[PDB]
């Protein structure tokens, strides 16, 4: 996360971290249920073998509530391709159920029609993760969160070197130095409706990080709600 | 549903709720069934 603030205790409980063989976090994920993590398809390429850590807020310190889970099944969207970064979604079934506790709790999945009309029309969403704090810099050792405005699809298309598809939406800032960054990829974009946080996006990609005239691009979860339901039923 | 979300706490008049929640008596609010319901920040 570029800009933003460290998450307060219990504020980002749906955050998951994918960790590689070197025990290093390389991508985020969203807790959907005791057995399922939502992440980005492109994250699956970055590490031949990985695990999921939940409950972590500081990667340099072992604190209560941290737990590591083996992934039993990877369900990657069959239409994902690095050519377009379209269909950038995956679901991970964990070997052993997550025990919900402080800092460990699922984000809600919305109903398609309602989310499109009611959630996505909200002013802002929240993104979080452990990724780079500057475009070329180091990953954060602390879990960070950032409020990101939804950005008009057409404004975003005009700003982008690459095709923005119906499976993507844009969020963040034109010039303000705040954005998700590499390492946050795969992580949650959630939208508050009243007092409940619903998963609306998967941190996907951007041209640089917090670049002037560029936005953050997210996988539009509403387009994949049936796919997620199907994937979660095996 | 157009205005005020039909006064529903979650999904919209016919209100409804996400998994781990039950629609309240009033037919609008949503009641969490467990201690760690989806979409709620956690408290000690
Ligand atoms: C909103 O979340 C994020 C915001 C920004 C970022 N930013 C980033 O990750 C950039 C930072 N780093 S860097 C310079 O520090 O080494 C390189 C990353 C990048 O260049 N990503 C990138 C760019 C373009 C496509 N793309 C799109 C369409 C078609 C083909 C296609 O390749 C795919 C990509 F991976 C990440 C988020 F996860
Ligand atoms: Ca820790
Ligand atoms: Na920008």
* CATH T-level fold of A1-12+107-222: Thrombin, subunit H (2.40.10)
Interface contact A38, partner B, CB < 8 A: no
The domain spans of chain A are: 1-12+107-222, 13-106+223-234
Question: Which residues 8-37 of B have a C-beta within 8 angstroms of A?
Answer: 9-12, 16, 18-20, 30, 34-37
Mutate to test the interface with A, among B35, B37, B42, B43 (most CBs of A within 10 A): B42
Q: What kind and span of H or E run contains B31?
A: strand B30-32
**Ligand 3: centre distance to CA A158 (Å):** 13
Read off the DSSP letter of residue A194.
Answer: T
Cα–Cα distance measured from residue A60 to residue A128, given in angstroms and rounded to the nearest whole number: 18
Q: Is the dihedral of CA A203, A77, A138, A55 positive or negative?
A: positive
Q: Is the dihedral of CA A159, A146, A178, A67 positive or negative?
A: negative
Cα–Cα distance measured from residue A5 to residue A146, given in angstroms and rounded to the nearest whole number: 7
**Does the Cβ of A136 fall within 6 Å of ligand 1?**
yes
CATH number for the domain running over B1-44:
2.10.25.10
Q: Name the token pair of A129.
A: 């993760």
The experimental method, as deposited, was X-ray
- C-alpha closest to that of A52 among A90, A14, A17, A12: A17
Residues of A with catalytic roles: 42, 88, 185
The domain spans of chain B are: 1-44
**Does the Cβ of A180 fall within 6 Å of ligand 1?**
yes
Decide if A1 contacts A145 (C-beta within 8 A): yes
Alpha-carbon Rg for chain A in angstroms: 16
- A13-106+223-234 maps to CATH 2.40.40.20: no
- C-alpha closest to that of A98 among A31, A50, A29: A31
Named by the residue before each, gaps in chain B exceeding 2.5 A from C to N are: 12
């Amino acid at each position: 996360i570029v800009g933003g603030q460290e998450c307060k205790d219990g504020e980002c409980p749906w955050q998951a971290l994918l960790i590689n063989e070197e025990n290093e976090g390389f991508c985020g994920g969203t807790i959907l249920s005791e057995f399922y993590i939502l992440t980005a398809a492109h994250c699956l390429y970055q590490a031949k073998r990985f695990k999921v850590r939940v409950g972590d807020r500081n990667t340099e310190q072992e604190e209560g509530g941290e737990a590591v889970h083996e992934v039993e099944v990877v369900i990657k969207h069959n239409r994902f391709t690095k050519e377009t970064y379209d269909f950038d979604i995956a679901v991970l079934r964990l070997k052993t159920p997550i025990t919900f506790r402080m800092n460990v709790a699922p984000a809600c999945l919305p109903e398609r029609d309602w989310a499109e009309s009611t959630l996505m029309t909200q002013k802002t969403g929240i993104v979080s993760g452990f990724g780079r704090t500057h475009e070329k810099g180091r990953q954060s050792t602390r879990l960070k969160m950032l409020e990101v405005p939804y950005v008009d699809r057409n404004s975003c298309k005009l700003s982008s070197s690459f095709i923005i598809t119906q499976n993507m939406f844009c969020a963040g800032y034109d010039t303000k130095q705040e954005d998700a960054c590499q390492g946050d990829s795969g992580g949650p974009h959630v939208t508050r409706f009243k007092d409940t946080y619903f998963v609306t996006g998967i941190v996907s990609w951007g041209e640089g990080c917090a670049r002037k005239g560029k936005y953050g691009i997210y996988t539009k979860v509403t387009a994949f709600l049936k796919w997620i339901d199907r994937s979660m039923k095996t | 549903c157009s205005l005020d979300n039909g006064d529903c706490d979650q999904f919209c008049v016919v209100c409804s709720c996400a998994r781990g929640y039950t629609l309240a008596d009033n037919g609008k609010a949503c009641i969490p069934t467990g201690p760690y319901p989806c979409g709620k920040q956690t408290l000690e």
